[PDB]
Symmetry: C3
Subunit: 151 residues, 3 copies
């Protein structure tokens, strides 16, 4: 419910093109609560486990190499239906189909340079959060606006 | 008729709810209507009485959320507004996004700024008939200001 | 290559009058499209009649030409993968009544006849429009510093 969490990663192209603050602002202004935030170079072992559902796809090795080629911003956000709603805010996975107003619709063009990843399901979010963050890196606090965001 | 000056003079009632005020979204919301080309006619900051809210939401008096909605709308100040323009009722609703924020698209006010249906930041008239009733209920005629936008000939044919 | 497709975008006199030039350009730059041509001009009625030749028999044609000649326009050429189709998506529906929030027309204008901008509808129309509005020498070629982060 209101405490659902999702994993969002800003990809190396999102960092290189100076979109970190823009992306974070979209989640903050929506009313989602920041739980975790890290900046790192993800190892190929970590990326292969993150993208384990894609291990049989032809683009898998290139996606892992690319995701390891620069730093990423790993994040955890909390809120009601944050997994599904986070995916709507990102826009379609393929930027060609993403609508203006979405992060990919506004800021990127091609699927291998799509700036961001968001968990596709509550099950995938729980696995991704556990893989990228130690439990002690996730911060719990109450937003001063909680009563104005949720009944 | 299409292209008539009178069609450009349609008005709608928009209220920024207590959560929109609390979360500092008043300026953001007003900027969206101004940049679109809609003309501001009325604007006031007020605490709406429960009697005014019960009449505003009279069609919902039998819904289970009615009492909570009236209490919530009375719990803080609201920004009441009247905007004018071609199809401003329907287009204002499109700009707000779906009533339930879960279904509102990015780019819309609710799509960008809020999450749950009971805390949806804003109300807009659902039809020209509801707009006429709502404008009359929230504003005295002397609070509605008429003027001509300097960009009128660049917004309308 | 497919990443070198080009489209023609014109900001109409109402877009210039209402101070939307920078906002429109920012939308194309932030998307990752490359600016190729940019010129500010009063389009002649002869140029506009050729640009809108397919509408010469429509009842609104004379008013459209007069309107497009009534003030300056910003003529532009942008480059990128599927920039024609994607540029149209970014502009929003031709009729602003049907354009969604988040698009240029959805955010900034209301009526057809004052719809702030034009974008090529097809690669064939883009080639014709670019040739009509720009001399080849006005089109600038350079490589974006972010090319490898926009395209694989
Ligand atoms: N050709 C490709 N090159 C690189 N990554 C790709 C390619 N096709 C798909 N993907 C990635 O493969 C993942 C799955 O995308 P799909 O389109 O197959 O499914 P999805 O729309 O349900 O996410 C996406 O990763 P992301 O969530 O980190 O964006 C997508 O970007
Ligand atoms: N659970 C709820 N709690 C509070 N208000 C609600 C709830 N469900 C619906 N409403 C409100 O009830 C009003 C009518 O919304 P509906 O979606 O029911 O519309 P409808 O009656 O045509 O279906 C909306 O008010 P607004 O225009 O000021 O936003 C909507 O927000
Ligand atoms: N009543 C009208 N007055 C002025 N221009 C019009 C009118 N109806 C259509 N047009 C213009 O006629 C052109 C063709 O619009 P259509 O709706 O017929 O087709 P489109 O949606 O497939 O592009 C558009 O020009 P633009 O690309 O420069 O915007 C459109 O604006």
């Amino acid at each position: 419910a209101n405490c659902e969490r999702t994993f969002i990663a800003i990809k190396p192209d999102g960092v290189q093109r100076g979109l970190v603050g823009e992306i974070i602002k979209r989640f903050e202004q929506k009313g989602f609560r920041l739980v975790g935030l890290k900046f790192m170079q993800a190892s190929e072992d970590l990326l292969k486990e993150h993208y384990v559902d894609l291990k049989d796809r032809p683009f898998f090795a290139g996606l892992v190499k690319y995701m390891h080629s620069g730093p990423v911003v790993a994040m955890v956000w909390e809120g009601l239906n944050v997994v599904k709603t986070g995916r709507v805010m990102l826009g379609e996975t393929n930027p060609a189909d993403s609508k203006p107003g979405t992060i990919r619709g506004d800021f990127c063009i091609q699927v291998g340079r799509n700036i961001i990843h968001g968990s596709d399901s509550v099950e995938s979010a729980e696995k991704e959060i556990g893989l990228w963050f130690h439990p002690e890196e996730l911060v719990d606090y109450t937003s001063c606006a909680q009563n104005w965001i949720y009944e």
